[PDB]
Amino acid sequence: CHPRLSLHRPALEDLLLGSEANLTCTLTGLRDASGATFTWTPSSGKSAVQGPPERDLCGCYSVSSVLPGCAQPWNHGETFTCTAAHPELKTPLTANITKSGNTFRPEVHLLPPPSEELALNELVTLTCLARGFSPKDVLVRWLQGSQELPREKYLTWASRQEPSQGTTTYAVTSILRVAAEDWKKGETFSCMVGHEALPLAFTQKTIDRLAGKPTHINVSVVMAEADGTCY
Amino acid sequence: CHPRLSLHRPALEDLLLGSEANLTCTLTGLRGATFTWTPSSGKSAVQGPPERDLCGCYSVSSVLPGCAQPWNHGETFTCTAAHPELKTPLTANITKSGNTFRPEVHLLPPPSEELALNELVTLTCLARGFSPKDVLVRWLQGSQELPREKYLTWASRQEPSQGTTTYAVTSILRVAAEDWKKGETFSCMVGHEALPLAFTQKTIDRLAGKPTHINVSVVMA
Amino acid sequence: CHPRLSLHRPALEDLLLGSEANLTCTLTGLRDASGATFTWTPSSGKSAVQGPPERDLCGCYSVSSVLPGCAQPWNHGETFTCTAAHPELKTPLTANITKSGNTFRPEVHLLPPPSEELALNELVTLTCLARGFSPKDVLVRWLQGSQELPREKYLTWASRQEPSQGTTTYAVTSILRVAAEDWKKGETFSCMVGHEALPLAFTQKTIDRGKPTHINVSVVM
Ligand SMILES: *[C@@H]1O[C@H](CO)[C@@H](O)[C@H](O)[C@H]1NC(C)=O
Ligand SMILES: *[C@@H]1O[C@H](CO)[C@@H](O)[C@H](O)[C@H]1NC(C)=O
Predict the structure, then answer these.
(1) Structural domain B96-221, CATH architecture
(2) Where would I find the H helices in chain C?
(3) At which residues is glycosylation annotated (chain A)?
(4) Neighbours of B60 (CB within 10 A)
């Protein structure tokens, strides 16, 4: 039915681990096609190419656009605007976007395997929880030793909003299943989280067999020459 | 503009808690209609009193109630529709699932980095490896069941193995530090179709993360 | 020496395990005619079945009245009624039943094994104790790991009334005997209790080898 125009933030995986940074601005409710060419208030190379539209419920057309090169305006704190001229409305429709403020940084925790899984000796599982961050975009990757595991080895849920104790924050989880022989050989596994509010955009926590439910605390302290003309 | 038919399995919150379990056939059109159910069951249904969706065709539903024992008994249900815009009647059907699997539930203790700020401790519940993807999760404190507005549970994704198809789901609950240091206990419950007694429970308190022995030695040499 | 009529309740195993519900109405005593007219005052269509020709002592002919489908009306608060009239007893009589109020939730403990047999290394006992619930209807089941043990590997007493201050609460016990190799190896067990005052119909406690922590500190000069 009637058209409606929306704006979309740049993807998180391209700002952290990438080079290019494309914004995008779509408009649904287009009948077949139109002569809409968009307007963007910083216009340094506005290669706003649209391409073939997509089909909706019972057959409809929706066309969009992009704009490249958005690292330094998006992180420095610029502003953007998208608007297009089209038939099926009175006034041409507009939209604006800005990098958010009033953010929080995530608290990352890596939990050891439960004690019951260790006796069966088939596989174990390691849980990675991130908690209390204000925008809802995150990245979770795993490492074994120092080598990154491929994406199809683990499972990550989505970011959701947790019950309120003040400001509104979010959370996420992930699990990885590894062979129970390697847990006793002494390998290490570690979890990485990438978020906007962190200082260098990534942080990590690490766990192996000794650190984390050890059933053993051994510590030796040797203090050598306590009466020893300290200068 | 376009016709469509569906069925739906009865919801798990009604199959497990209070047995009044419905079974829904929808039709999305009329851009007047009669439905027919092949198991007799005596009690007839009620038609939808026909809301609209997606800016378009107003759908119409009809619900056959009182079918909680033939669902678990292994019976089969089909519902047959009719409409002016339909050339033939449409039919579809639904059965109970076969070759189920039961879940494995774990409750993990809070990380020790968290106890140093004196605000709130975090408990984590995980359930893994069950074949039909429908599940329930409920938390407790002692015996008092907590209201649902106090925790957060995720959906039920599919986990990456090569053997079969299995699923998993998580949940967190943040309780106060003063109640944690007193020795209050907390529990996590999971409900599944494939469990024999329909519920399983795990609990925790401020012990059971503490280590079993500590060896310190100070050498003045 | 002649009985009068009264009315029983549904079985808790059937009412909790999701299957069905019945309701029984009985008189007996003498081998007389089959004009035992059982009549139910509320009846949603499917009325009762005049039951099997059961016998009791000196030919005391018992037949009963049993109706299916009694979960939702019993649970939300109806008030059922049974009336009867006999060829000998042509003077009719009636009884009533009602789901109770004034409920309390149970408290379940599991207790570790008995140092005397902890040294003997032959067999160990685990005792489950429930206490303080309002009707005299419970279930007890035992588990190991995630697997349910059969009902022949333990014993359970009946629920006696406990004497204490003011109100009438109840209690019941059960014991389980298991060999020592898996008990010292680290296998775990569970005790479950079903009761109609709990909001999710069940609770469950588990036990395993509750010890304190060791601390060794040594100074070497
Ligand atoms: C952004 O647009 C909204 C309406 O779409 C308007 O209310 C708001 O003032 C705009 N903000 C700026 C900074 O232009
Ligand atoms: C009923 O369900 C079966 C699968 O159980 C399917 O193969 C069939 O197409 C369905 N419809 C019928 C028999 O009309």
Answers:
(1) Sandwich (2.60)
(2) 12-16, 72-76, 116-120, 180-185
(3) 22, 96
(4) 22
Domain locations along chain A: 1-98, 99-231
What is the enclosing helix (H) or strand (E) of A163?
none
**C216 interfaces chain B, CB cutoff of 8 Å:** yes
Cβ contact B106:A116 at 8 Å: yes
Query: Which pair of tokens denotes residue C58?
Result: 């000196």
Sequence-distant (6+) residues with CB within 8 A of C46 are: B42, C67, C68, C69
> Cβ of B167 under 8 Å from any chain A Cβ?
no
Angle at A173 between CA A167 and CA A175, to 5 degrees: 170
Dihedral of CA atoms B11, B13, B16, B18 in degrees, nearest 10, equals: -100
How far is residue A60's CA from residue C165's CA, in Å, rounded to a whole number?
75
**CATH superfamily of domain region C99-221:** Immunoglobulins (2.60.40.10)
Buried b (16+ CB within 10 A) or exposed e, A120-158: eeeebbbbbbbbebbbebbbbbbeeeeeeeeeeebbbbe
Pocket lining: B95 vs ligand 2, CB cutoff 6 Å: yes
CB B97 within 8 A of CB B132: yes
The tally of CA atoms less than 13 A away on the side-chain side of residue B44 is 5
- Which residues precede chain breaks (C–N over 2.5 Å) in chain A? none
Which atom of ligand 2 is nearest to B92's Cα? 11
- CATH level 3 topology of A99-231: Immunoglobulin-like (2.60.40)
Identity of the residue numbered B38? T
How many C-beta atoms lie closer than 10 Å to residue C167's C-beta? Answer: 9
For A13, the token pair is: 């995986």
Method: cryo-EM
B209: left (phi over 0), alpha (psi -120 to 50) or beta: alpha
Task: Compute the radius of gyration of chain B from its Cα atoms.
Answer: 25
**How many Å apart are CA A158 and CA C67, to the nearest integer?**
50
CA C85 to chain centre: 32
Q: Give the integer Cα–Cα distance in Å for A50 and A33.
A: 11
- Are B219 and A218 in contact (CB < 8 Å)? no
Distance separating alpha carbons of residues A181 and A28, to the nearest angstrom: 54
- Answer for the pair A213, B164: CB distance below 8 angstroms, yes or no: no
Q: Residue A17 in contact with residue A144, Cβ under 8 Å?
A: no
Mutate to test the pocket of ligand 2, among B7, B9, B93, B96 (most ligand atoms within 8 A of CB): B93
Nearest-atom index, ligand 2, CA of B93:
1
Tell me which chain A residue has its CA closest to the CA of residue B221: A224
